[PDB]
Amino acid sequence: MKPVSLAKYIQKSPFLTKLLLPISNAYVHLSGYRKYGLRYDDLMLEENDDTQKALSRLPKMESYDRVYRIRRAMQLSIENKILPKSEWTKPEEDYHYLRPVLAEVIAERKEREAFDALIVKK
Amino acid sequence: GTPKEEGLHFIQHDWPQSKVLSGFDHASLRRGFQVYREVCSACHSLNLIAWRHLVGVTHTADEAKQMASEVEYEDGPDDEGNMFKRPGKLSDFLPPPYPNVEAARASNNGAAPPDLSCVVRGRHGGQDYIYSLLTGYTEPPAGVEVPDGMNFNPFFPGTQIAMARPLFDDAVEFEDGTPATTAQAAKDVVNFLHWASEPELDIRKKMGFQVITVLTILTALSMWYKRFKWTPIKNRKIFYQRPIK
Amino acid sequence: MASSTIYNIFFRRNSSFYATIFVSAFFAKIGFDVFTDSVWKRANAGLTWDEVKPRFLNKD
Amino acid sequence: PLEKMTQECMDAPDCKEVKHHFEECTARVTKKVEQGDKSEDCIEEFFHLYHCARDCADPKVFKVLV
Amino acid sequence: MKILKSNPFLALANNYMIDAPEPSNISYFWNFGSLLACVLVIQIVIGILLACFYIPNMDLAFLSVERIVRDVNYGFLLRAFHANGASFFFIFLYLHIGRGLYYGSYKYPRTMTWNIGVIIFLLTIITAFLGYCLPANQMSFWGATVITNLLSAVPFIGDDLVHLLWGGFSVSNPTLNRFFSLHYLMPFVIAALSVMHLIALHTNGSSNPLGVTANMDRIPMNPYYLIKDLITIFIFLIGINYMAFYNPYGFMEPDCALPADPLKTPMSIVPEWYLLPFYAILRAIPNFQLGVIAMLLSILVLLLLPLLDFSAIRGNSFNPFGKFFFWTFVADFVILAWIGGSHPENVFITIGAIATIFYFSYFFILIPVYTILGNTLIDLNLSSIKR
Amino acid sequence: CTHLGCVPIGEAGDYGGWFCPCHGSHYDISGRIRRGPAPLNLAIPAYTFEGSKIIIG
Amino acid sequence: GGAAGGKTYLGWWGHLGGPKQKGIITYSLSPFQQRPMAGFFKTSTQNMFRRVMTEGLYVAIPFGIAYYIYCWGKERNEFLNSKHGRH
Ligand SMILES: COC1=C(OC)C(=O)C(C/C=C(/C)CC/C=C(\C)CC/C=C(\C)CC/C=C(\C)CC/C=C(\C)CC/C=C(\C)CC/C=C(/C)CC/C=C(\C)CC/C=C(\C)CCC=C(C)C)=C(C)C1=O
Ligand SMILES: CCCCCCCCCCCCCCCC(=O)OC[C@H](COP(=O)([O-])OCC[N+](C)(C)C)OC(=O)CCCCCCCCCCCCCCC
Ligand SMILES: CCCCCCCCCCCCCCCC(=O)OC[C@H](COP(=O)([O-])OCC[N+](C)(C)C)OC(=O)CCCCCCCCCCCCCCC
Ligand code: HEC
Ligand code: HEM
Ligand code: HEM
Ligand code: FES
């Protein structure tokens, strides 16, 4: 249905976050999406109505940069090679830029769905 | 299962027909056919091979006709019912010793000599297993006894064969002149049975070489042509002119 | 001559292309048949019925 | 020809441990059966010894079988 | 306008072969659809000729096959090619299914395509089982007897459907006649289902290894993907030609060159190798009906994959846990096939039970847990970057 | 024969029943297997009795 | 024609249903001017070495474990049904 994650309950307890930081570092290094010069939010599926609407509300600069990044990544994937270690996606630039818009759209849809189902309890 | 009830693993040899560019040994084929006719034509049936098959492989046409003209066959109805025997033709199958399976069972205790047309291809080992079975008759070791009507043979499943030693020393007189030991004769019989299983080996292995060569050349050309056509895409260059507002 | 004449003759029009393809195929079939016949004949020496004929039947 | 070469390979130094096991069989099992016990059959050692002998002997003889 | 874009039949051909936008970076694992289509075409064409010399009767079926093999001109080629193509069909089917599973091609917009493929796989299995029973070999007769009895697990009309299918009381002439007719009929239905498969897929395009959208850099099919398939076609031709010219009965068990004796009980009764894992799964469950249910579920569980894969990304190119567990599952599948092949002895039944437990655990416990864990780890690392 | 499908001989064997010389096994007078390579007992048909005639099937 | 079809995500040439692009210059050469079999061996060898060193254990571990248990199972099953195994 939708992606799920226990990414907040662990944040509730600081000790669990402190314990799981190195494992998350190693896992993100092992994933290897940064070797293609991409960002994580690019890989999210866009085939429903929510993400299609969200992608049309981004700033123009973000859309153009995303288009260039995707095209360069696919051009590299054509020849089965990666960029040198200098041109890798640094952690500072690997921020979440699509999640808030999707959250806003989902909130709007959920509000409409809530209004849809109502009852009168006298 | 238990090693006794599954038999001994067959030995491995090298045959001329097992290579990649080799056919049969037709002299061995003819000698094996002679041994077959003079030994196991009495009980084992090969009712899937015609006299015309041996023409041009182990015998000439005149030889095949002369040899086949000595077997009496049964033909269709006469002018008033009846059934009349024939001197044999070149389009008949080799004669089966028994008229039906029940007669074979009655004659040989309770066993049933299997048909030899497709036995080599239908056994776990083929030529090696058949040769080892033929040459593997030994006296039983202490502790295991064989009842009357059975023989000890480790290569047979259960180590109890219903046969007797079929190939003794100097059982057949070879036309070529080779001595007829229990090793040479078994090898020739195995070769002939393998031929009877797959008579099309020579033509198949002759066609395969040319087919493989042509296909290899075609594949080698395709691997180059794809790289030729797919060149202006694998070597693209993409530049990003940042769109300043 | 050079290399432009070759393009002018066969590789100029599709009609003059398919005919070359078919003729080359016809010749290549014969060439490959001769090659495989020679190699198979060389492979088997003293192992076929034609070369074991005198041993058996010539003595009758 | 095959029997002689197989016997020679049986007495050859190549297969001597399996032959030792088969000898210990023959002694023990013969004593057991002549005592009057029919419960033991070490056909496995005969299998091993025969396999060793045949592997030793068959390639030698098979070359001259023409 | 070009004629290819105007005439309706030429337009149909063009929209699917000449000018079709496709992703520009699909690897060599996307070449198996054409291979499957060519194998199916070869099978149908060769079977049409093979039906010209076969007599469908229990008393006279083996001699007809032998006459085909050793009396007709180049009949051995026909028989060996049909058998080996039917064998290669399942290899390419397994490769297609593995490609679809590994790169996550089942999680929309292409899910009808996956279901149609699953149905096609079921029909292919049924057709192969019907086909291999025809030559009236020993394993053919005995395996037909063993497999056909599985219909008795139905509660009410069980033990009557078996007799209706047998057309009597045991495998006899009517059974062979019905099997021949159904084996002749089914491949055309399979071809129609494949046409529907292609039609369903065409409306949304194919995926790419990266798992991201490819609506930015597209290239037409010809000549860029009409030549990439030729290499695989020629390689498969080389393989099948070698297997049919130097070792025709190389995929075949030694207990198949004997006439079916209805009294001779074979030591081991097993089907062909491509159906071995399901037979291994069936024999694991001590109960009877539960075994049939599990065997059917082992193939019908592919439909439930879309609704139990909670992943924020599509594919396995950027998911180490999936990369590990997919190969582990493939090894488990191979081990299951090996266990099904061998005897049901002491250690083998325990190994088969363990393999079945893992196989049925993979599609229910492993996938959601590791997908959720990957999502959680990635989100946790991404949430503490600037700090 | 339940072992490899052969025709046994009756009124014989060590146990006074059916005897199979194809593989040297004996079936008891009651019809079951006692010794030999035969795994299981003999099979029983679904016959019915009608006076002096028995119908098998 | 018309017929008022449904909604898809592919379209056709000209309108492929993608985001608007800007300032992406692309150069390519002619197949008759470039040279096939140029740098193929070097790049292919480097890519194969990198792929082997990168993926590697992902395939190495499960197959190795499966082979080990296969060999152990075969050996143990052969031993148990022998003479000394049953005892
Ligand atoms: C992106 O996706 C794409 C794919 O992937 C990349 C693709 O795959 C394809 C699909 C492309 C295709 C090939 C279309 C079909 C493929 C499928 C979708 C699935 C497979 C479909 C099929 C089953 C193919 C159809 C085949 C059929 C229906 C059966 C074929 C049968 C034969 C060819 C006959 C066989 C021959 C026999 C047995 C005998 C032939 C007759 C004789 C001539 C014998 C001799 C007899 C005589 C001499 C008698 C006398 C003759 C006479 C009377 C003539 C004399 C002359 C006179 C003038 C009188 C597309 C479109 C696609 O976009
Ligand atoms: C339609 C179903 C899907 C497809 C199923 C596969 C169909 C396979 C048969 C057709 C294969 C070719 C398709 C048509 C390609 C074509 O356009 O042919 C023309 C080309 C030359 O075209 P060019 O490459 O652009 O060069 C230009 C030449 N000028 C104009 C300068 C002279 O010249 C050539 O291409 C000549 C080589 C190919 C021609 C056929 C000869 C080889 C095949 C012989 C027949 C065997 C095939 C039997 C089995 C199919
Ligand atoms: C192969 C052995 C040698 C056999 C040698 C003998 C074979 C027969 C030789 C001629 C075969 C081709 C017949 C048509 C020839 C022709 O001139 O067609 C030209 C046009 C080209 O189409 P266009 O110019 O791009 O568009 C025109 C649209 N207007 C402007 C009119 C509105 O129309 C087109 O071609 C449109 C392209 C698609 C339609 C044609 C597809 C089939 C072509 C081959 C048909 C014959 C195949 C025979 C195979 C046995
Ligand atoms: C004494 C009659 C007789 C002789 C002579 C004879 N056979 Fe047999 N053969 C039989 C019988 C009976 C069986 C069945 C044995 C059994 O089923 O245990 C048999 C079995 C076989 C088998 C089947 C082995 C198996 O595992 O199923 C082969 C092969 C065979 N014999 C080959 C030969 C060859 C070769 C010769 C000639 C050297 C030969 N036989 C001579 C009667 C004979
Ligand atoms: C029009 C299509 C087909 C026809 C007319 C056909 C017909 C036949 C016939 C007559 C046989 C008997 C072989 C013999 O007598 O030796 C056979 C065998 C067989 N067929 Fe087909 N078949 C067709 C398609 C297929 C397909 C699509 C498959 C698998 C997907 C298949 C798999 C098999 C198998 C496994 C065998 C047994 C192999 C063997 O006999 O050695 N067939 N088929
Ligand atoms: C048997 C199980 C099958 C399944 C589960 C299946 C499923 C799929 C899926 C999901 C895709 C799209 C993959 C992607 O876009 O990434 C696909 C593609 C395709 N399928 Fe199948 N399919 C099956 C069998 C077949 C058969 C039998 C044929 C043809 C006879 C076929 C022909 C094709 C073709 C031509 C494509 C597009 C090109 C390609 O992917 O190679 N498929 N299939
Ligand atoms: S039928 Fe097998 S031993 Fe009696």
PDB file of N, CA, C and O and ligand atoms in Angstrom, chain B residues 35-36 39-40 42-44 98 108 111-114 116 119 123 129-130 133-134 150 156-157 160-167 189-190 193, chain E residues 264, chain F residues 22-23, ligand 4:
ATOM      1  N   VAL B  35      28.535 -62.667 -33.013  1.00  0.00           N
ATOM      2  CA  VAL B  35      28.435 -63.245 -31.674  1.00  0.00           C
ATOM      3  C   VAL B  35      26.993 -63.217 -31.189  1.00  0.00           C
ATOM      4  O   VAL B  35      26.513 -64.176 -30.570  1.00  0.00           O
ATOM      5  N   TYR B  36      26.281 -62.117 -31.445  1.00  0.00           N
ATOM      6  CA  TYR B  36      24.869 -62.043 -31.085  1.00  0.00           C
ATOM      7  C   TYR B  36      24.093 -63.195 -31.705  1.00  0.00           C
ATOM      8  O   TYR B  36      23.414 -63.949 -30.999  1.00  0.00           O
ATOM      9  N   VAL B  39      25.031 -66.642 -30.245  1.00  0.00           N
ATOM     10  CA  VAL B  39      24.899 -66.875 -28.810  1.00  0.00           C
ATOM     11  C   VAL B  39      23.504 -66.527 -28.304  1.00  0.00           C
ATOM     12  O   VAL B  39      22.775 -67.402 -27.826  1.00  0.00           O
ATOM     13  N   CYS B  40      23.116 -65.255 -28.400  1.00  0.00           N
ATOM     14  CA  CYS B  40      21.919 -64.777 -27.719  1.00  0.00           C
ATOM     15  C   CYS B  40      20.702 -64.699 -28.627  1.00  0.00           C
ATOM     16  O   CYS B  40      19.652 -64.213 -28.195  1.00  0.00           O
ATOM     17  N   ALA B  42      19.237 -67.299 -29.301  1.00  0.00           N
ATOM     18  CA  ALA B  42      18.452 -68.424 -28.805  1.00  0.00           C
ATOM     19  C   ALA B  42      17.358 -67.970 -27.847  1.00  0.00           C
ATOM     20  O   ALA B  42      16.277 -68.569 -27.809  1.00  0.00           O
ATOM     21  N   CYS B  43      17.621 -66.943 -27.048  1.00  0.00           N
ATOM     22  CA  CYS B  43      16.629 -66.529 -26.058  1.00  0.00           C
ATOM     23  C   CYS B  43      16.300 -65.044 -26.099  1.00  0.00           C
ATOM     24  O   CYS B  43      15.140 -64.677 -25.898  1.00  0.00           O
ATOM     25  N   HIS B  44      17.280 -64.180 -26.349  1.00  0.00           N
ATOM     26  CA  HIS B  44      17.041 -62.743 -26.390  1.00  0.00           C
ATOM     27  C   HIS B  44      16.526 -62.331 -27.762  1.00  0.00           C
ATOM     28  O   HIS B  44      17.058 -62.761 -28.791  1.00  0.00           O
ATOM     29  N   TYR B  98      10.850 -66.738 -29.150  1.00  0.00           N
ATOM     30  CA  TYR B  98       9.603 -67.156 -28.538  1.00  0.00           C
ATOM     31  C   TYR B  98       8.417 -66.453 -29.192  1.00  0.00           C
ATOM     32  O   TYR B  98       8.538 -65.312 -29.649  1.00  0.00           O
ATOM     33  N   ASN B 108      12.182 -70.177 -19.180  1.00  0.00           N
ATOM     34  CA  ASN B 108      13.261 -69.781 -18.276  1.00  0.00           C
ATOM     35  C   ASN B 108      12.711 -69.529 -16.872  1.00  0.00           C
ATOM     36  O   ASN B 108      12.633 -68.396 -16.393  1.00  0.00           O
ATOM     37  N   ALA B 111      11.586 -65.978 -15.193  1.00  0.00           N
ATOM     38  CA  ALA B 111      12.156 -64.728 -15.677  1.00  0.00           C
ATOM     39  C   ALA B 111      11.597 -64.407 -17.062  1.00  0.00           C
ATOM     40  O   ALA B 111      10.721 -65.101 -17.585  1.00  0.00           O
ATOM     41  N   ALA B 112      12.108 -63.346 -17.677  1.00  0.00           N
ATOM     42  CA  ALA B 112      11.643 -62.902 -18.990  1.00  0.00           C
ATOM     43  C   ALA B 112      12.784 -62.160 -19.667  1.00  0.00           C
ATOM     44  O   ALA B 112      13.084 -61.009 -19.315  1.00  0.00           O
ATOM     45  N   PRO B 113      13.461 -62.789 -20.625  1.00  0.00           N
ATOM     46  CA  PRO B 113      14.581 -62.131 -21.309  1.00  0.00           C
ATOM     47  C   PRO B 113      14.141 -60.832 -21.958  1.00  0.00           C
ATOM     48  O   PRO B 113      13.308 -60.836 -22.877  1.00  0.00           O
ATOM     49  N   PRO B 114      14.673 -59.699 -21.504  1.00  0.00           N
ATOM     50  CA  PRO B 114      14.256 -58.413 -22.068  1.00  0.00           C
ATOM     51  C   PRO B 114      14.704 -58.257 -23.511  1.00  0.00           C
ATOM     52  O   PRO B 114      15.719 -58.812 -23.939  1.00  0.00           O
ATOM     53  N   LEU B 116      16.415 -56.578 -26.616  1.00  0.00           N
ATOM     54  CA  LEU B 116      17.727 -55.946 -26.653  1.00  0.00           C
ATOM     55  C   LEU B 116      17.798 -54.762 -27.609  1.00  0.00           C
ATOM     56  O   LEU B 116      18.889 -54.230 -27.837  1.00  0.00           O
ATOM     57  N   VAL B 119      18.137 -51.475 -24.961  1.00  0.00           N
ATOM     58  CA  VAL B 119      18.547 -51.760 -23.589  1.00  0.00           C
ATOM     59  C   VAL B 119      19.751 -50.918 -23.177  1.00  0.00           C
ATOM     60  O   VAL B 119      19.833 -50.468 -22.032  1.00  0.00           O
ATOM     61  N   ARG B 123      19.620 -48.208 -19.599  1.00  0.00           N
ATOM     62  CA  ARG B 123      20.247 -48.699 -18.381  1.00  0.00           C
ATOM     63  C   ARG B 123      21.200 -47.649 -17.832  1.00  0.00           C
ATOM     64  O   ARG B 123      21.800 -46.874 -18.581  1.00  0.00           O
ATOM     65  N   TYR B 129      28.032 -50.418 -18.164  1.00  0.00           N
ATOM     66  CA  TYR B 129      27.265 -51.332 -17.327  1.00  0.00           C
ATOM     67  C   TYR B 129      27.081 -52.682 -18.003  1.00  0.00           C
ATOM     68  O   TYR B 129      27.227 -53.729 -17.361  1.00  0.00           O
ATOM     69  N   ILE B 130      26.759 -52.683 -19.299  1.00  0.00           N
ATOM     70  CA  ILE B 130      26.533 -53.944 -20.000  1.00  0.00           C
ATOM     71  C   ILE B 130      27.814 -54.766 -20.051  1.00  0.00           C
ATOM     72  O   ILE B 130      27.804 -55.978 -19.797  1.00  0.00           O
ATOM     73  N   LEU B 133      28.613 -56.142 -16.580  1.00  0.00           N
ATOM     74  CA  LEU B 133      27.716 -57.249 -16.274  1.00  0.00           C
ATOM     75  C   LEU B 133      28.138 -58.512 -17.012  1.00  0.00           C
ATOM     76  O   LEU B 133      28.116 -59.610 -16.444  1.00  0.00           O
ATOM     77  N   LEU B 134      28.523 -58.376 -18.282  1.00  0.00           N
ATOM     78  CA  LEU B 134      28.929 -59.542 -19.060  1.00  0.00           C
ATOM     79  C   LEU B 134      30.210 -60.164 -18.515  1.00  0.00           C
ATOM     80  O   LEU B 134      30.344 -61.394 -18.490  1.00  0.00           O
ATOM     81  N   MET B 150      19.827 -69.255  -9.568  1.00  0.00           N
ATOM     82  CA  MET B 150      20.336 -67.896  -9.475  1.00  0.00           C
ATOM     83  C   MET B 150      21.858 -67.923  -9.457  1.00  0.00           C
ATOM     84  O   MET B 150      22.472 -68.905  -9.033  1.00  0.00           O
ATOM     85  N   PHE B 156      24.780 -56.558 -10.772  1.00  0.00           N
ATOM     86  CA  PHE B 156      23.334 -56.572 -10.945  1.00  0.00           C
ATOM     87  C   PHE B 156      22.643 -56.128  -9.658  1.00  0.00           C
ATOM     88  O   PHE B 156      23.074 -56.503  -8.563  1.00  0.00           O
ATOM     89  N   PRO B 157      21.589 -55.318  -9.764  1.00  0.00           N
ATOM     90  CA  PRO B 157      20.852 -54.891  -8.563  1.00  0.00           C
ATOM     91  C   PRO B 157      20.333 -56.086  -7.780  1.00  0.00           C
ATOM     92  O   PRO B 157      19.525 -56.875  -8.275  1.00  0.00           O
ATOM     93  N   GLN B 160      21.836 -60.880  -7.749  1.00  0.00           N
ATOM     94  CA  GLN B 160      21.191 -62.154  -8.082  1.00  0.00           C
ATOM     95  C   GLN B 160      20.676 -62.051  -9.517  1.00  0.00           C
ATOM     96  O   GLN B 160      19.590 -61.520  -9.764  1.00  0.00           O
ATOM     97  N   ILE B 161      21.460 -62.558 -10.452  1.00  0.00           N
ATOM     98  CA  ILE B 161      21.065 -62.612 -11.853  1.00  0.00           C
ATOM     99  C   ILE B 161      20.454 -63.976 -12.137  1.00  0.00           C
ATOM    100  O   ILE B 161      20.833 -64.991 -11.543  1.00  0.00           O
ATOM    101  N   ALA B 162      19.477 -64.000 -13.041  1.00  0.00           N
ATOM    102  CA  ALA B 162      18.847 -65.243 -13.462  1.00  0.00           C
ATOM    103  C   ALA B 162      19.551 -65.882 -14.650  1.00  0.00           C
ATOM    104  O   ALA B 162      19.175 -66.985 -15.058  1.00  0.00           O
ATOM    105  N   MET B 163      20.557 -65.217 -15.210  1.00  0.00           N
ATOM    106  CA  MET B 163      21.311 -65.760 -16.325  1.00  0.00           C
ATOM    107  C   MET B 163      22.394 -66.715 -15.833  1.00  0.00           C
ATOM    108  O   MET B 163      22.725 -66.777 -14.647  1.00  0.00           O
ATOM    109  N   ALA B 164      22.951 -67.463 -16.776  1.00  0.00           N
ATOM    110  CA  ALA B 164      24.201 -68.182 -16.596  1.00  0.00           C
ATOM    111  C   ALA B 164      25.282 -67.469 -17.391  1.00  0.00           C
ATOM    112  O   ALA B 164      25.000 -66.557 -18.172  1.00  0.00           O
ATOM    113  N   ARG B 165      26.533 -67.878 -17.176  1.00  0.00           N
ATOM    114  CA  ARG B 165      27.649 -67.282 -17.903  1.00  0.00           C
ATOM    115  C   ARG B 165      27.448 -67.465 -19.402  1.00  0.00           C
ATOM    116  O   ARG B 165      27.580 -68.583 -19.916  1.00  0.00           O
ATOM    117  N   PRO B 166      27.126 -66.399 -20.136  1.00  0.00           N
ATOM    118  CA  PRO B 166      26.760 -66.563 -21.546  1.00  0.00           C
ATOM    119  C   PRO B 166      27.962 -66.685 -22.468  1.00  0.00           C
ATOM    120  O   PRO B 166      27.913 -67.408 -23.468  1.00  0.00           O
ATOM    121  N   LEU B 167      29.047 -65.991 -22.140  1.00  0.00           N
ATOM    122  CA  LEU B 167      30.222 -65.904 -23.003  1.00  0.00           C
ATOM    123  C   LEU B 167      31.389 -66.628 -22.339  1.00  0.00           C
ATOM    124  O   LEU B 167      32.033 -66.090 -21.434  1.00  0.00           O
ATOM    125  N   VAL B 189      30.058 -57.393 -28.613  1.00  0.00           N
ATOM    126  CA  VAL B 189      28.616 -57.456 -28.389  1.00  0.00           C
ATOM    127  C   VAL B 189      28.097 -56.124 -27.869  1.00  0.00           C
ATOM    128  O   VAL B 189      27.031 -55.655 -28.283  1.00  0.00           O
ATOM    129  N   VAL B 190      28.831 -55.501 -26.946  1.00  0.00           N
ATOM    130  CA  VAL B 190      28.419 -54.204 -26.420  1.00  0.00           C
ATOM    131  C   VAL B 190      28.386 -53.166 -27.534  1.00  0.00           C
ATOM    132  O   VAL B 190      27.452 -52.359 -27.623  1.00  0.00           O
ATOM    133  N   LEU B 193      25.298 -53.835 -29.715  1.00  0.00           N
ATOM    134  CA  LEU B 193      24.069 -53.430 -29.038  1.00  0.00           C
ATOM    135  C   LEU B 193      23.936 -51.913 -28.998  1.00  0.00           C
ATOM    136  O   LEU B 193      22.834 -51.376 -29.174  1.00  0.00           O
TER     137      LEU B 193
ATOM    138  N   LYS E 264       5.693 -54.083 -13.915  1.00  0.00           N
ATOM    139  CA  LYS E 264       7.025 -53.692 -13.469  1.00  0.00           C
ATOM    140  C   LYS E 264       6.943 -52.387 -12.687  1.00  0.00           C
ATOM    141  O   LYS E 264       6.646 -51.335 -13.261  1.00  0.00           O
TER     142      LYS E 264
ATOM    143  N   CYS F  22      11.119 -66.012  -9.128  1.00  0.00           N
ATOM    144  CA  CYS F  22      11.730 -64.930  -9.892  1.00  0.00           C
ATOM    145  C   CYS F  22      12.780 -64.201  -9.062  1.00  0.00           C
ATOM    146  O   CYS F  22      13.819 -63.783  -9.586  1.00  0.00           O
ATOM    147  N   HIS F  23      12.523 -64.039  -7.758  1.00  0.00           N
ATOM    148  CA  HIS F  23      13.486 -63.409  -6.861  1.00  0.00           C
ATOM    149  C   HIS F  23      13.644 -64.174  -5.548  1.00  0.00           C
ATOM    150  O   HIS F  23      14.215 -63.633  -4.593  1.00  0.00           O
TER     151      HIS F  23
HETATM  152  C1  HEC H   4      20.315 -68.700 -20.507  1.00  0.00           C
HETATM  153  C2  HEC H   4      19.536 -67.962 -21.619  1.00  0.00           C
HETATM  154  C3  HEC H   4      20.216 -66.611 -21.929  1.00  0.00           C
HETATM  155  C4  HEC H   4      21.422 -66.428 -22.482  1.00  0.00           C
HETATM  156  C5  HEC H   4      22.260 -67.504 -23.206  1.00  0.00           C
HETATM  157  C6  HEC H   4      21.616 -65.001 -22.642  1.00  0.00           C
HETATM  158  N1  HEC H   4      20.586 -64.356 -21.984  1.00  0.00           N
HETATM  159 FE1  HEC H   4      20.740 -62.498 -21.146  1.00  0.00          FE
HETATM  160  N2  HEC H   4      19.041 -62.816 -19.994  1.00  0.00           N
HETATM  161  C7  HEC H   4      18.325 -64.009 -19.980  1.00  0.00           C
HETATM  162  C8  HEC H   4      17.337 -63.942 -18.926  1.00  0.00           C
HETATM  163  C9  HEC H   4      16.316 -65.030 -18.529  1.00  0.00           C
HETATM  164  C10 HEC H   4      17.517 -62.559 -18.284  1.00  0.00           C
HETATM  165  C11 HEC H   4      16.718 -61.952 -17.111  1.00  0.00           C
HETATM  166  C12 HEC H   4      17.586 -61.949 -15.858  1.00  0.00           C
HETATM  167  C13 HEC H   4      16.851 -61.265 -14.736  1.00  0.00           C
HETATM  168  O1  HEC H   4      15.856 -60.550 -15.020  1.00  0.00           O
HETATM  169  O2  HEC H   4      17.262 -61.429 -13.558  1.00  0.00           O
HETATM  170  C14 HEC H   4      18.595 -61.934 -19.016  1.00  0.00           C
HETATM  171  C15 HEC H   4      19.099 -60.676 -18.782  1.00  0.00           C
HETATM  172  C16 HEC H   4      19.940 -59.985 -19.621  1.00  0.00           C
HETATM  173  C17 HEC H   4      20.087 -58.547 -19.688  1.00  0.00           C
HETATM  174  C18 HEC H   4      19.316 -57.529 -18.822  1.00  0.00           C
HETATM  175  C19 HEC H   4      20.192 -57.092 -17.653  1.00  0.00           C
HETATM  176  C20 HEC H   4      19.387 -56.228 -16.722  1.00  0.00           C
HETATM  177  O3  HEC H   4      19.972 -55.675 -15.755  1.00  0.00           O
HETATM  178  O4  HEC H   4      18.158 -56.092 -16.945  1.00  0.00           O
HETATM  179  C21 HEC H   4      20.995 -58.267 -20.624  1.00  0.00           C
HETATM  180  C22 HEC H   4      21.473 -56.861 -21.042  1.00  0.00           C
HETATM  181  C23 HEC H   4      21.461 -59.518 -21.185  1.00  0.00           C
HETATM  182  N3  HEC H   4      20.795 -60.546 -20.547  1.00  0.00           N
HETATM  183  C24 HEC H   4      22.402 -59.665 -22.179  1.00  0.00           C
HETATM  184  C25 HEC H   4      22.805 -60.859 -22.733  1.00  0.00           C
HETATM  185  C26 HEC H   4      23.873 -61.029 -23.694  1.00  0.00           C
HETATM  186  C27 HEC H   4      24.733 -59.876 -24.257  1.00  0.00           C
HETATM  187  C28 HEC H   4      23.959 -62.331 -23.995  1.00  0.00           C
HETATM  188  C29 HEC H   4      24.955 -62.996 -24.975  1.00  0.00           C
HETATM  189  C30 HEC H   4      26.401 -62.918 -24.440  1.00  0.00           C
HETATM  190  C31 HEC H   4      22.948 -63.032 -23.227  1.00  0.00           C
HETATM  191  N4  HEC H   4      22.264 -62.102 -22.469  1.00  0.00           N
HETATM  192  C32 HEC H   4      22.697 -64.388 -23.239  1.00  0.00           C
HETATM  193  C33 HEC H   4      18.543 -65.075 -20.825  1.00  0.00           C
HETATM  194  C34 HEC H   4      19.703 -65.316 -21.530  1.00  0.00           C
END
